[PDB]
Design a protein around this nucleic acid. Structure first.
Ligand SMILES: [Mg+2]
Ligand SMILES: [Mg+2]
Ligand SMILES: [Mg+2]
Ligand SMILES: [Mg+2]
Ligand SMILES: [Mg+2]
Ligand SMILES: [Mg+2]
Ligand SMILES: [Mg+2]
Ligand SMILES: [Mg+2]
Ligand SMILES: [Mg+2]
Ligand SMILES: [Mg+2]
Ligand SMILES: [Mg+2]
Ligand SMILES: [Mg+2]
Ligand SMILES: [Mg+2]
Ligand SMILES: [Mg+2]
Ligand SMILES: [Mg+2]
Ligand SMILES: [Mg+2]
Ligand SMILES: [Mg+2]
Ligand SMILES: [Mg+2]
Ligand SMILES: [Mg+2]
Ligand SMILES: [Mg+2]
Ligand SMILES: [Mg+2]
Ligand SMILES: [Mg+2]
Ligand SMILES: [Mg+2]
Ligand SMILES: [Mg+2]
Ligand SMILES: [Mg+2]
Ligand SMILES: [Mg+2]
Ligand SMILES: [Mg+2]
Ligand SMILES: [Mg+2]
Ligand SMILES: [Zn+2]
Lengths: 96, 108, 127, 130, 74, 50
RNA sequence: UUAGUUGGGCACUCUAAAGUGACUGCCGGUGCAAGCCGGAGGAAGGUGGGGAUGACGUCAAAUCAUCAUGCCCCUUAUGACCUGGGCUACACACGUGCUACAAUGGAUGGUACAAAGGGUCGCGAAGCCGCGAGGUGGAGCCAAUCCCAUAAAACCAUUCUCAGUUCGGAUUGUAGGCUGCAACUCGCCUACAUGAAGCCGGAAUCGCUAGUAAUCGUGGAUCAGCAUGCCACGGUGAAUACGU
């Protein structure tokens, strides 16, 4: 009954966040699953290397985002506020 | 035979493709409305079939009659004065095809 | 209740099970000949079953999904190979000697940043 | 037998092996029908009867390319001569590809063909300036 | 164009000049509008299409159908 | 006119085919993407400092 | 259930965290040795593959306009505000290529499979009126939940004999389709008609050493439309290193 998805460009703006949310739900709620790791997206947006001339040799740059998830429904009042109190740790923003 | 001279040893669809107006598909349909089999040699196109085909193609521009259908329009373009006419009389592309590299098959 | 395994070759993946029977090989719910009409996977998808003297050990229902014509055909083999090994440990030596147990590591590569493909350097003359 | 890998498919420039397999099987079956011998042997007869005495090449003498005799290697000449065989089965105007390959192979088994006399094409040109 | 909306022509050359040449219609016009199309309603009058250098006068004949009001001055 | 090129392709253009995508960091008119609303080159220049 | 469909379940693929793995680690030949050549074991052998990173510096090293700054200048101005400029040619030579004389392929058909972006205007459904392209209408959500999207060329069938031949497709005639205020030069595509050059190519020359060359499609960034260009992705996938 709870859908709190996540997405960030880091393995540390979510891993600690998943640890915290899981700890809060396990202590508070009962019906809960394990940390479900959602997929990742990995771009390639290559460019040109020079200033004006010589466009036959260039480097590439990306912006890759992974995704995390969690879900828990049946619990108690201590887990009622989890979707809003214990959420996104440093570096990211995930909407319940 | 049928408007013009056709080969007498090739398939009818292939044989009927030797007129200025009879191509590869519009003649396949034309020979279909005449109710004649398409994969039989021109030898089997006997007097009955030859008459049927001749009556079939009598309304489709072909042979030297279908040549004034071309030159009248080009002469009209030359008389009108459009850039297409100027290029057609000269050898460059009538369309916008670029002729500072490899435009020779149409101009020598 | 059956011999289990997994497989892969080129860009494919397999999950082949050698369930006991007589030799009716069915690949991803299709006949032994409609899926592979040619003879490409006639011995190749069978030599792993004949890796030991066990051709009729199991009518192995197969499962190949993803990849290519021989990529999946190299995957059914990559599944049957471990199947005989999992059912019987002694089937490992036949896979090792036959040149059939190796996870084929060849795969397609990247594309260079200024070439004309993965390796084909362009053509150009100076004078 | 690497003929499928080196002649049909190698001249089948699409990296296709199925057409090579089909052509090879058809030629072998046609040979085994009319001649009565299995392909395991008659296909071998053309292995060493395709490399000429030497190769055909030009040598620069005093900075000018002149006629001198040079040869190709047991892999270079083997490769170029299997290529010449794939040409010899193809130089004729025979309609069917499999039939053409089978007929050239049978003629080579009978010691004749554009690959049988090709032993002089890369030899006589070099033997004319040895 | 070859679309499903039919003909088109710039209104500056036509609306108050070519569609309004009925009285004392024996003059030409320095029609800088070369985008327009020579519709059948303007047969007889003359428009001076601009080819870049000077507004070249144009004659509207019966066979002019099949060209713009500025395509005869390349 | 170069600093006046933010007034022909930036002012009020009176047609639907009178506006394209220059960059905003540098005023370059060519090679300017819209998924980062910027140009090339200068992404080798801002994506180094940060 | 027409079907992953609905329930059911993490079994399998899958996705992402911590491991394991590969190290001349063992055996043999050579070699005082370093090491070279085999073999084992092993998923891979020998810097596994590929990246990314380009020391000291040469072809007068560029930028005070990214920022800071020393000296020198303007202070009714060198400060602040108000607002308008150049296009595909063709007698020719030259570089990369795409199609071509492709059964390695053609009127049509049955129908296996990638990566990535982004997403609140952002794709945009279906149904829809059409061979092919547009307009009606909109399903889905702040997200592996909703869109672009449909991977097909393969493999497997019909007609054609290597074409001036049922090959090739420019060149033109006609009639259409879209996007775009508007397709005159100067967008692309389709249908009918037309049907050329072009038969493995001189001197010479380019790239390449295994998932590589060759070979067929798919996709993205620029963008209303316009790629045969660039940058990615897989299917099928070889010959050869005598040698300096
Ligand atoms: Mg025709
Ligand atoms: Mg002309
Ligand atoms: Mg054009
Ligand atoms: Mg063209
Ligand atoms: Mg040129
Ligand atoms: Mg030229
Ligand atoms: Mg040229
Ligand atoms: Mg799949
Ligand atoms: Mg082993
Ligand atoms: Mg290079
Ligand atoms: Mg170069
Ligand atoms: Mg040159
Ligand atoms: Mg032949
Ligand atoms: Mg735009
Ligand atoms: Mg710029
Ligand atoms: Mg930089
Ligand atoms: Mg081993
Ligand atoms: Mg480094
Ligand atoms: Mg570098
Ligand atoms: Mg120099
Ligand atoms: Mg500069
Ligand atoms: Mg030249
Ligand atoms: Mg064609
Ligand atoms: Mg198709
Ligand atoms: Mg055409
Ligand atoms: Mg017509
Ligand atoms: Mg696309
Ligand atoms: Mg040397
Ligand atoms: Zn910039």
């Amino acid at each position: 009954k709870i859908r709190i998805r996540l997405k960030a460009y880091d393995h540390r703006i979510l891993d600690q966040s998943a640890e915290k949310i899981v700890e809060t739900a396990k202590r508070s709620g009962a019906s809960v699953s394990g940390p479900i790791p959602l997929p990742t997206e990995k771009s390639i947006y290559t460019v040109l290397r020079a200033v004006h001339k010589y466009k036959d040799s260039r480097e590439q740059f990306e912006m890759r985002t992974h995704k995390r998830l969690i879900d828990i429904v049946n619990p108690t009042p201590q887990t009622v506020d989890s979707l809003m109190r214990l959420d996104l740790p440093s570096g990211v923003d995930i909407e319940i | 035979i049928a408007g013009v001279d056709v080969p007498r040893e090739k398939r009818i669809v292939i044989s009927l493709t030797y007129i200025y107006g009879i191509g590869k598909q519009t003649a396949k349909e034309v020979l279909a409305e005449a109710g004649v089999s398409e994969d039989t040699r021109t030898r089997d196109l006997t007097e009955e079939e030859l008459g049927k085909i001749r009556e079939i193609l009598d309304r489709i521009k072909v042979e030297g009659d279908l040549r004034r259908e071309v030159n009248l329009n080009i002469k009209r373009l030359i008389e009108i004065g459009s850039y297409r006419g100027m290029r057609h009389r000269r050898g460059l592309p009538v369309r916008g095809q670029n002729t500072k590299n490899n435009a020779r098959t149409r101009k020598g | 209740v059956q011999y289990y395994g997994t497989g892969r070759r080129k860009s494919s993946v397999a999950r082949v099970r050698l369930v006991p029977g007589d030799g009716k090989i069915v690949i991803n719910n299709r006949d032994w000949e409609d899926y592979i009409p040619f003879a490409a996977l006639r011995e190749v998808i069978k030599q792993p079953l004949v890796a030991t003297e066990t051709l009729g050990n199991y009518d192995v229902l197969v499962n190949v999904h993803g990849g290519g014509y021989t990529g999946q055909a190299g995957a059914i083999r990559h599944g049957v190979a471990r199947a005989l090994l999992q059912v019987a440990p002694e089937y490992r030596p036949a896979l090792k000697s036959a040149g059939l147990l190796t996870r084929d590591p060849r795969m397609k590569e990247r594309k260079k940043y200024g070439l004309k493909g993965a390796r084909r350097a362009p053509q150009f003359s100076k004078r | 037998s690497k003929l499928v890998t080196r002649l049909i498919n190698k001249m089948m420039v699409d990296g296709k092996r199925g057409k090579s397999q089909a052509i090879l099987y058809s030629a072998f079956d046609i040979i085994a029908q009319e001649t009565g011998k299995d392909p395991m042997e008659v296909f071998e007869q053309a292995m060493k009867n395709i490399m000429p005495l030497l190769e055909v090449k030009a040598r620069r003498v005093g900075g000018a390319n002149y006629q001198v005799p040079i040869e190709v290697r047991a892999d270079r000449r083997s490769t170029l001569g299997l290529r010449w065989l794939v040409n010899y089965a193809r130089l004729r105007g025979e309609k069917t590809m499999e039939v053409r390959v089978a007929r050239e192979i049978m003629d080579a088994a009978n010691n004749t063909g554009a690959s049988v006399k090709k032993r002089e094409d890369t030899h006589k040109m070099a033997d004319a300036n040895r | 164009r070859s679309l499903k909306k039919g003909p088109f022509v710039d209104d500056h050359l036509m609306k108050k000049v070519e569609a309004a040449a009925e009285s004392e219609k024996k003059q030409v016009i320095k029609t800088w509008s070369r985008r327009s199309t020579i519709f059948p309603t303007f047969v007889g009058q003359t428009i001076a299409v601009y080819d870049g250098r000077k507004h070249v006068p144009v004659y509207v004949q019966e066979d002019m159908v099949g060209h713009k009001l500025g395509e005869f001055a390349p | 006119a170069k600093k006046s090129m933010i007034a022909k392709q930036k002012r009020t253009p009176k047609y639907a085919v009178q506006a394209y995508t220059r960059c905003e960091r540098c005023g370059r008119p060519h090679s300017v993407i819209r998924k980062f609303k910027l140009c090339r080159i200068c992404f080798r220049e801002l994506a180094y400092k940060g």
